[PDB]
Design a protein around this nucleic acid. Structure first.
Lengths: 95, 241, 174
RNA sequence: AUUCCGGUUGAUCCUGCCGGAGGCCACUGCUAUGGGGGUCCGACUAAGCCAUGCGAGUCAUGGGGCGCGCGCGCGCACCGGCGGACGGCUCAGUAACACGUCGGUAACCUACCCUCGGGAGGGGGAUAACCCCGGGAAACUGGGGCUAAUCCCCCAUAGGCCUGAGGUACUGGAAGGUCCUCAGGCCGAAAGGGGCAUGCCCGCCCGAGGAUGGGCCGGCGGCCGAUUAGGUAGUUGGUGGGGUAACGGCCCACCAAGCCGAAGAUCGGUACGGGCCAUGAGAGUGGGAGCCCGGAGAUGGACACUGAGACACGGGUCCAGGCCCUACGGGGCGCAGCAGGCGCGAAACCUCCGCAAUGCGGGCAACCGCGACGGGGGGACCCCCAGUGCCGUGGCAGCCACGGCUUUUCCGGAGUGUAAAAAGCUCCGGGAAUAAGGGCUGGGCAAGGCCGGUGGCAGCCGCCGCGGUAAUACCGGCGGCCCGAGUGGUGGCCGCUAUUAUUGGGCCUAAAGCGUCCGUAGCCGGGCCCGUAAGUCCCUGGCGAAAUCCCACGGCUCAACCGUGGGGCUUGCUGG
């Protein structure tokens, strides 16, 4: 699977880096959040924490999925801005 | 049957001056009473969320608003219902961004980016005059605001002139009159967002408003109403359009 | 008042049992491998819409009129039913066989990717045919002019290998 | 597709009606694989009756106090504050300034909100919670003691209202308006409170204006009936006053005799109004449940309190009519809110999950609540895209034998998806196997002159017409044609219909000229000249919400759908 960053965007008010990326998986299924996070952090020098994946989406026939990710400066601002359902869905918090 | 005032607003019934999706949902933010009208203003949350894109939901927008990270006319505004309007200035000092609110040739409101120097001035149109106790003159402006002046200098302020003012402290500079060579910016009607110079005024009897003719720099002439002709300069503009 | 209801996009004939119409539609159905009469009827309705737009615009004075004229001509050129140096009278000479030729099933046959129209329909529906980059499964897609050369077999598909038994049986025709 | 076909005669040409053939809505028979989108589903009869559970709350940074742990922190209730007048349901009544559009209020009210200019001084009081004692079957409720406030009251000062006499500073098209000076009088504010801290945050009262929302007025516009022709008596106006937030016969006292009407008043019938919808080549005809804007109602009817706002669906009082609990003294209730039930009928769903998204109220905020909203469940509601196999050889006339292939769909699984799920999307394993019917078969009208039964019986039949012993017309069998996950039956509307005719019909003989004349309103009106510019024509300013309609581009695989822009619609009004 390849991961190709299409856009990065900066937010000073909430203190976040928004990231739009494409995933290329020709012949394979839709990949997993763990793997996508590993690749993202390895490639952009980010913390495995303070990083969440809002969605990975597949289309009708593409073998090319899309993603949206957010990288925060501080775990505190993170837990304050982001709701709990994505945190549980990612694994950064135990319900 | 209705026993009182309204507190909701549906999206199919929202004014046309807005950039909004009408079928995505059923409900819209009803603005609160304030400076401008409903047909001439848009709340702040729509700016924070749908124009600039600093938030995707409304909780995030409320959160940034309740921390003084956004100003309007040099003042902090925490209410997501506050109506923003024409000739107003939106300032984000954490990103160095300054926008001025203006309409299009279509009638919709937009954000024109300006500089920090011009972000400290706001033009006002004198809409009426009154004499109040202490024998003082009260000018009633176009955003619903008011200014006090002495009697000695009453003949210098009339009911269509324009006044430039430092926004937060609200001190006057550079009055501009309504004459036959003044620069103009139309704010409503069929010829909205056009610009040009005045040529002729015309009056009518028994309640009908006054009309004015204007010439654009391509040389073409067009008429409109006198209350729609915002004065912004003498020979050239003082702000950015 | 009464609100909106979605309406059909195809028309039915005025009489169901006229010999000439029956014969013609029979021949077309057979020679283009259609499943119903709805498809034929909706292609015919497309044509009739184009034809009515032309009839209306013709000799209409203004600015929106010429705008719509150019829009129509460009749309037809893009679909592939008219050349570039065309005029508003070349529309009224069009027929339904052209609209029928501009669909995937027929193009896949005329291109040599399938031996028959039914085989082409099966390929399209099972997902072995690609457009510029995509997998489309609708044999009535109305291919455009800039895509007719980007139609191939999909990467994941046995037919995409040159030595497939059935692909060799297909190339055995040409 | 600006369309025709069958039927009066032994045969013919006409008029004229009936039927066929197209589309949309409601009920319904037989049959049924799968997805996506959407403003669909107790409207028609009973605005009939309802068992159970939910549909409106929040603030601990307003105040005192109880409990649990270390003055602090957690939790509960009470007083107090804002809200509950929005949102949600329905179509009874209403032929009306109710609705639409243009205008007006110089004749009016407005808590939450914005701007500006100014203020927060001095005293007093009670009473819930808490403790003692209780009563009543309950619903509900009594006495005593103690206490606080952003609770209540009082003085003062600001300020509010009336009147009279003057000055003319402001707006405006125009001052019974605002401002200045004087005079005589009635009513009459406020919480410097709370928090952090060694000044900042949230707040209280007055005034001038705006915004938001409403009340009132006016011109134009839009059903049927003459087997309904005269109606009205505070009825029409005036003078003077009361009352209202405010103009006004809205009401009162007095003076007059007016007001509406054949260009159809009054009366009676039906009916929420529009944007819109169906149909048609178009003119035109018909409808107005679902989504938006406005209005009205909450078992029928009448009347009031609190509040900025109600004569108040989930708050009050009474009468009528219905039902329930009771310890028989007395008490309580009305789903046209979500689901669920009875009844009525031809005729309409789960007593489900959530406040994550869109929004509202409360709160400095964090945040809580919401049967609104969102999400799934059941349903031949409407629209879009597909499936029920393909290839080659051979034999027949689309089928069969043979040999290979594919997996939309099906069976099972891993990810993503989702508030959590499900579905959908990507991948893997198996395997042509898991999936066509309904009406018709004499002509109109496409398609059998084939076979067996019935024998003027039984039955068919929109219409014409078959059937009385070789039935192409009944019943069945085998074949065939139309449409196709759909196809038929009943009722309603448009079209067919130039059978309602402005475009565009007819009246010697077929329906149809008054028995004939004179004349009122009304409609139609000879030729030239001068004027005006009301109708009419052109150009331009301000209005006719959005959705809906047409076109192009772009985003969900294309589409249906959504978005950006350009045009129309809004049957028109108005300033030059």
């Amino acid at each position: 699977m390849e991961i190709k960053v299409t856009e990065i965007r900066e937010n000073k008010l909430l203190g976040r880096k928004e990231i739009y990326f494409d995933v290329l998986h020709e012949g394979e299924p839709t990949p997993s959040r763990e793997a996508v996070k590993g690749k993202l952090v390895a490639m952009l020098d980010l913390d495995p924490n303070t990083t969440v994946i809002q969605y990975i989406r597949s289309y009708f026939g593409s073998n090319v999925s899309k993603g949206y990710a957010k990288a925060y400066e501080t775990r505190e601002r993170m837990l304050y801005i982001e709701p709990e359902y994505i945190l549980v869905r990612d694994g950064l918090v135990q319900k | 049957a209705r026993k009182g005032p309204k507190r909701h607003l549906k999206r199919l019934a929202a004014p046309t001056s807005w950039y909004i999706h009408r079928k995505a949902y059923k409900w819209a933010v009803r603005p609160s009473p304030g400076p401008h009208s409903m047909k001439t203003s848009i709340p702040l949350i729509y700016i924070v969320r749908d124009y600039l894109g600093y938030a995707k939901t409304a909780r995030e927008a409320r959160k940034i608003l309740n921390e003084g990270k956004i100003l309007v006319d040099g003042r902090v505004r925490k209410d997501y219902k506050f109506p923003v309007g024409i000739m107003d200035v939106v300032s984000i000092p954490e990103t160095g961004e300054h926008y001025r609110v203006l309409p299009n040739r279509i009638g919709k409101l937009i954000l024109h980016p300006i500089s920090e120097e011009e972000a400290k001035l706001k033009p006002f149109r004198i809409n009426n005059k009154r004499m109040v106790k202490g024998a003082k003159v009260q000018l009633n402006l176009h955003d619903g605001s008011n200014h006090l002046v002495s009697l000695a200098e009453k003949d210098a302020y009339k009911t269509s002139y324009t006044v430039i003012m430092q926004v937060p402290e609200r001190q006057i500079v550079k009055v501009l009159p309504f004459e036959v060579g003044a620069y103009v910016f139309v704010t409503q009607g069929k010829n909205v967002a056009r610009k040009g110079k005045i040529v002729e005024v015309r009056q009518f009897p028994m309640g009908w408003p006054d009309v004015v003719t204007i010439e654009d720099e391509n040389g073409e002439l067009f008429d409109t109403l006198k209350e729609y002709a915002f004065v912004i300069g003498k020979d050239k503009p003082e702000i950015s359009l | 008042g009464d609100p909106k209801r979605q309406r059909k996009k195809y028309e039915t004939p005025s009489h169901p049992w006229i010999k000439e119409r029956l014969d013609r539609e029979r021949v077309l159905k057979r020679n283009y491998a259609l499943k119903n009469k709805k498809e034929l009827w909706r292609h015919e309705t497309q044509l009739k819409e184009f034809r009515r737009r032309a009839r209306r615009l013709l000799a209409a004075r203004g600015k929106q009129a010429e705008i719509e004229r150019q829009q129509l001509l460009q749309r037809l050129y893009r679909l592939g039913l008219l050349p570039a140096d065309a005029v508003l009278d070349d529309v009224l000479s069009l027929t339904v066989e052209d609209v029928l030729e501009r669909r995937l099933q027929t193009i896949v046959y005329r291109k040599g990717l399938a031996r028959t129209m039914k085989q082409a329909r099966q390929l399209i529906v099972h997902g072995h045919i690609e457009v510029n980059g995509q997998v489309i499964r609708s044999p009535g897609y109305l291919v455009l002019r800039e895509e007719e050369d980007t139609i191939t077999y999909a990467k994941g598909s046995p037919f995409a290998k040159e030595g497939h038994p059935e692909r060799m049986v297909i190339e055995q025709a040409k």
